[PDB]
Symmetry: D2
Subunit: 386 residues, 4 copies
């Protein structure tokens, strides 16, 4: 099996916010470097890295390698950039698990990175010309990142569709949203994010020192009344700017090793990867997805699980999962989620797994992390935290 | 053991830039190859456990292009999918799948590469936050696909650097290109690419590679070097930008056996190498030492023709006889849809070796930021 | 004190993206200005001022008329401005006539030019940014040139409104369109456009014939065409001119100067009229201008030997038939813009020119040139041809 | 036959991306033409035509001058034209003067407008395609507006060239710059721009002051400034104006028509001169334009009470000293474009009016307004009543 030796994330930034100046490759390098520092592992020793990134446009050749070089890894470390939309930050970890299990490696770096703030605009008729009449200035973040390729609708449209399907009320979504924010704010104040987060420090333009050491998106200060008064976002629907995360900047990484290698090097791992699941479904079934399948393979019931993390693409997802999974909500995203913390799409997958790990401070046990992704794919990972 | 076998393989013709496949999207090219490979494999989409598709410049292609291609190929929503980025991508997809099979996580998989350089978009980096004074209208193909993120040069610059370091003359490079063109044309005419090409279908039909130019040394010696006044690489000794896709049905040797499939090839092993940016030769050697093999034991080699300079450096590093090397030509003649070339070289090596009722082959590829991927194959 | 036209020239009219695609508006302008001067037997050193009509100036640089003026071999000392009124080419002449009549000048160069092929697309979101969601890649030629600022509609819409208002049928428009092609082909074939046309020669080529004239055209082909910018309209690609490239220019003088220099004037400008009407009434604007001009000059329609009414739409000329009462055989005798194209800032120049040359050829007399323009403006000129 | 200026008004001048950022040029234009009509006591129905200067027309839609006139309340009946000459704002007035003198009209409205903040960027490779390799996102304000078509350089380069050709030191230019802010600050404070300025109101908001005047300037802050567009240059951000938002307009009439209506004109236009020169001789053109206007008119420089020479650069006014030989105490007494900004299409209009109002507050008379324009000169002589 595969074990998680270390885990770090950058704090998550608001769109056009605190990490606006920092490229996706830069956030990646920082977490990859920090993860290596935590594991007491030199970059010289890594056998490969995988970094998730959803919208790669304009970031240059092989963003994953660019990050790995920033991290301090030698040219000798093989590298690849992965796109599984949403699920990318976490699919990277599982993929690396697959590599180790196939016996090709014992020390790998895995993760996710996203700089939504820096995704460029495109000119689709730029190359061959528009010839006559108005054309488009395509926002690639919306197009490649948040737009379904089959139904041609914003992701929030699937969020709504799920709300309808499972009879999930606007108020119940709103209440969930409030909980994400309150639970996050409290977790942050209590320092529960200290273990996962590493700061981003840079000398900016004009010599300005910059230090970003805490998550930007948490609203303090919010209330049910405020949430209730929001207008629905992509349908005149129940999804609003309140009950869905925004668009954000962030990154996260892990040092993954075989159980044998970690032992020989005398590292005390954070957790072990028992196994993973993946699901595929019609595009509009984004909310559904996977955890159930994972449990069944491992001869486990929802009851055996101590804690779950389900990415809050929308409140409607977690809630859909409640109907599908049957977990107790008090065991689910105990420190908030994406709604409060933001959703750098490439990084979200890394964060939930990571967070779940640090929480299971309870001298903990069995955790499950799950994510939905564009085109109705589901990814689930079961962990045994020590 | 367990080991990975290539059950089937197909590719599209490789189109010229703004050429015959200009209107066809990369997901579309991918869908066709993924579909044909399953047909040739005699396997239903419903039994595929996964798909990995290489694609270098994903910009403006929509969410998850592999999944788009996968759905276009007839695979159900249940089949999981990804989209990968490594030059090497076409081929990294096959090896990554090989790891998944060896990890014992699946028995049937679809892997490949796709690229539509014709459809890569231009970008406005100042559009979102705003530009006073002129800005850039950036060519994402050049920028994301063909430019070194480290040295901030075009890849041909790296090609020239190799020529300088290994003392590879402009004339030898030109000789290799001529050779690439002649062998490919001969191969097309003898119908050797037929086993691997699947046509792409105001009805239109594209059934043949578009980039072969029939012509000689004299002409090549006359060409201006591209990103160097003083360089040896030219439009002539290097491939252009192109449109294409390729895909494979891959299985565990065990699963194919259970089904009565007689696979094209068994994948013996693979190596990856990494290097400073100005630097697939080292990769091959690595693959050979691990397998207790040497240059002599291998029947044929496919080394992607990123530049004439590349294969020629490898000879100096690996020491193969060029007579065993890109026998039906290469990328200089056939074009380079970057995400796809990795699939093509493996495939087209497998097919030539097969025609020869043959045996061992090595496919190797160079990629941006100096990475190298090589695969060892026993063809049946 | 009156204004005489001493000389006149135009370039052939190119098709959109056609023979003049690589030639800029000012270069086309420099050529007509040069030819006009040469034909008049006058040195640039002697010009007291220049005015060039140009409609979509975007991206052609500072003061295009001055670029053209220098290209024409005119010295630095000669004052220049760029004019924007579809009427710009004519208005440049009338403005110049007012100048001479004010006693400010005795020799002027007036004209108009357009390189519709060279008009850039624009990115209205560019300067301040798009932030999030799609923007527009705006076609300046359609926006600035072909779109009504008031009704926010394509000019074809007003063409249609006119047809409905005056009960001009689709078939009449088509018959008129067809007549234009037939007559333009005939005139060219007979050398009739030689007097106005000057060739454009350049290495990147020889351009000396009007590009847009169709010879294989018939009612059958025309009637099959779909309506444009409406569904249900009567305007089509056939009965409306396309978008085009070209320039036209004139040497103008006071009557006294030309006599003093021993020049044989082509014509004497007797007078002019301008009108403004509500936006939808573009078609009527020129007819009303002619009627105003005629009243002012003691003249009736019967008193005019020939009329040129710019063919913005076939509906326009037919609309003018209803208002003016002229006989259609005394109008656009060698065809019009439907046939030869409409390089917008230059049409007004051609129609005058070609009215002049036709009447000459007839040992001729009295003529009226009229043009409708955007925001429903009307311009008419009466010429006494010698 | 002569032309009189019955009325005049301008909007405040806004900084780039400033207070007027959200106002289109046609709109700035519409307000000024309505105010000029109200001030003159003339109905839009009585107007015989309009001309509005405007430099960068791109993206503003069909006939920006006509858009402005309707917004001003003029009926569809009034003929209109949009004009492009730096000098566009002033030239619209002289153009109209020539129409009145041709006996073609007795009532016209002339002016200029510019919204530099609203000029779009362009994609030259957008229509026919870039094909391969990077292309340009071109800033039309800079390209069409501020760059010489012939010499392919920013106008500041011509600004430098003059200083050098005429030996106008960095220090002299800077003293002038400080002077422009000082005076501009003083008049604004004392209500001296009150006559010309007309407020811009818009619910989205009130703008009734010039935004660009920098109180708090000094010669050591001006001297510390880096040269722009040339590393060895002497024109700076300090001694040249920026890019601005604004508009101005006038109600014009024949002398007879004005007398017929009971109007008491602000001023009478005595004549005007237009000059042309090699492109790098930008600074010299207005200077030559003035001398020609004085001579054609039997006048000497001593004959003029007040001069307005647009502050394209400090270098321009200083070059004009040399050429014309005026006393500077008579030049730009209430500051200029350096302090006020330069919405290029409207500056010519502003200078004529500020001049007229100044001469008028002194109960005075003879004035010359001059301006340089791209591609290298316009001058106007007026009798202020």
């Amino acid at each position: 099996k595969t074990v998680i030796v270390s885990a770090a994330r950058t704090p998550f930034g608001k769109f056009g916010g605190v990490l606006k100046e920092v490229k996706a490759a830069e956030l990646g390098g920082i977490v990859m470097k920090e993860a290596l520092q935590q594991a007491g592992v030199s970059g010289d020793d890594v056998e490969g890295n995988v970094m998730g990134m959803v919208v790669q446009a304009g970031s240059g050749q092989i963003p994953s390698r660019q990050a790995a070089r920033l991290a301090g890894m030698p040219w000798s470390v093989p590298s690849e950039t992965l796109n599984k939309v949403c699920a990318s930050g976490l699919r990277a970890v599982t993929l690396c698990d697959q590599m180790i299990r196939a016996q090709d490696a014992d020390i790998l770096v895995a993760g996710g990175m996203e700089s939504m703030s820096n995704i460029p605009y495109a000119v689709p008729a730029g190359r061959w010309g528009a010839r006559m009449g108005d054309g488009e200035l395509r926002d690639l973040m919306v197009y490649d990142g948040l737009t379904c390729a089959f139904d041609e609708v914003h992701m929030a449209v699937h969020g709504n569709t799920a709300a309808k399907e499972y009879a999930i009320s606007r108020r119940e979504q709103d209440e969930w949203a409030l909980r994400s924010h309150a639970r996050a704010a409290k977790a942050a104040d209590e320092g529960k994010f200290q273990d996962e987060i590493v700061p981003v420090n840079w000398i900016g333009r004009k010599g300005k020192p910059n230090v970003v050491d805490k998550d930007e998106a948490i609203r303090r200060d919010t209330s049910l009344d405020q949430l209730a008064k929001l207008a629905p976002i992509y349908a005149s629907g129940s999804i609003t700017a309140g009950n869905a995360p925004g668009v954000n900047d962030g990154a996260g990484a892990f040092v993954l090793m075989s159980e044998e290698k970690a032992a020989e090097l005398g590292k005390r791992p954070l957790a072990t990867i028992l196994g993973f699941s993946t699901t595929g479904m019609p595009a509009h079934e984004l909310a559904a997805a996977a955890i159930n399948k994972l449990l069944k393979k491992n001869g486990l019931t929802v009851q055996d699980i101590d804690l779950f993390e389900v990415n809050e693409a929308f409140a409607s997802v977690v809630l859909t999962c409640e109907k599908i999974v049957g977990f107790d909500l008090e065991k689910v995203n105990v420190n908030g989620g994406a709604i409060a913390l933001g959703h750098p799409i490439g990084a979200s997958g890394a964060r939930i797994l990571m967070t779940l790990v640090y929480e299971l401070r309870r001298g903990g046990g069995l955790g499950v992390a799950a994510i939905c992704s564009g085109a109705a794919q589901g990814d689930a990972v079961l962990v045994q935290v020590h």
